[PDB]
């Protein structure tokens, strides 16, 4: 399976910033959602899962064909929570009608990174949208329950390596677990893109507890969590040296995780050699908007 970027139809760096633009508007505007964490961080679990559903083998899944749209891939459970990122991305995307659906998810993300104050990620366009019989069977995205051994494996289907697993897993920074979601509770609550997630690890006396949904969970007093995939990274000697790293080093963890989520939400795709750069977006306080 080959997927080549096709760039929408005479679109340029312009196009794509107006969009970016509308996107990290409406981020600002809608600030209630999820008890006024806003949607950053639900639109950055939106490109991941989108782009995780990537099958390196047979070039299955993954960001390019915009399944997500479909009720197949809309309905996995493992998805549950991030209808809230599509209905928030829907009158972005009647705005801008041209865009391909795995381009606005893929961008969102991108947007909220960087709207709450994370690395800039390039990015690039060209995705096109896939027939529903292209959809990815449910089940192609990680379990939280399991051990540091799962979560390596379950990444090389990715094509991520160690540093890479490590740093994509500080987006869980932002954000919370939601029960009724995926079966865990609580968490920072923040909306600022931090090394913190490195940083709770290290620091907090974590406890391992039952939730109310008879699941194991990690929890500090000061009202962190952690999921067991998550707690891994400290219990796996190869993760906890690089858990170290990016919490000594905000800069350093910045520049990988936007390399990662860049190849992340770029695998299966191929881009012509002739394909525009990716683009940096500004962000609106850059653009003085
Ligand atoms: C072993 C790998 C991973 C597991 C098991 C996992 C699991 C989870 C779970 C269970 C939640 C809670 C969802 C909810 O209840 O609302 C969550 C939230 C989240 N995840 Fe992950 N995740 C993984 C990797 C990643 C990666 C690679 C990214 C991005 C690079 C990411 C981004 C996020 C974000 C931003 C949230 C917060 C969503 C919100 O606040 O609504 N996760 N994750
Ligand atoms: O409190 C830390 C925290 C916050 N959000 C998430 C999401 C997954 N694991 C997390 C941990």
Redesign the pocket.
């Known amino acids: 399976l080959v997927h080549v970027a096709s760039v929408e139809k005479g679109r340029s760096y312009e196009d794509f910033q107006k969009v970016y633009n509308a996107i990290a508007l409406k981020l600002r505007e809608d600030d209630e959602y999820?008890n006024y964490?806003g949607y950053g961080?639900?639109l950055?679990?939106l490109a991941?899962h989108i782009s995780?559903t990537w099958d390196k083998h047979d070039n299955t899944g993954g960001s390019y064909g915009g399944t997500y749209r479909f009720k197949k891939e809309f309905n996995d459970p493992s998805n549950?929570?991030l209808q809230n990122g599509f209905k928030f991305l829907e009158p972005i995307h009647k705005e801008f009608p041209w865009i391909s659906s795995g381009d606005l998810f893929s961008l969102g993300g991108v947007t909220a990174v960087q709207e709450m104050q994370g690395p800039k990620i390039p990015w690039r366009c060209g995705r096109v949208d896939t027939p529903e019989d292209t959809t990815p069977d449910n089940g192609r995205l990680?379990?939280?329950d399991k051990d540091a051994g799962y979560?390596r494996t379950?990444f090389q289907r990715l094509n991520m390596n160690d540093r890479e697993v490590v740093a994509?897993?500080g987006?869980?920074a932002?954000?919370?677990?939601?029960?009724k979601?995926?079966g865990?509770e609580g968490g920072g609550a923040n909306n600022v893109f931090t090394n913190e997630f490195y940083l709770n690890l290290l620091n907090e006396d974590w406890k391992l507890e039952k939730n109310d949904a008879n699941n194991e969970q990690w929890d500090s007093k000061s009202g962190y969590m952690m999921?067991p995939?998550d707690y891994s990274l400290i219990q796996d000697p190869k993760y906890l040296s690089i858990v170290k790293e990016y919490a000594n080093d905000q800069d350093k963890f910045f520049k990988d995780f936007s390399k990662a989520?860049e190849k992340?939400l770029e695998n299966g795709i191929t881009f012509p050699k002739d394909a525009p750069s990716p683009f940096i977006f500004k962000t609106l306080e850059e653009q003085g908007l």
């Open positions: 999820d964490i961080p639900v950055v679990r991941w995780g549950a929570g990680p379990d939280a979560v379950f994509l897993m987006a869980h932002l954000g919370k677990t939601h029960l979601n995926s865990y999921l995939t989520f992340l």
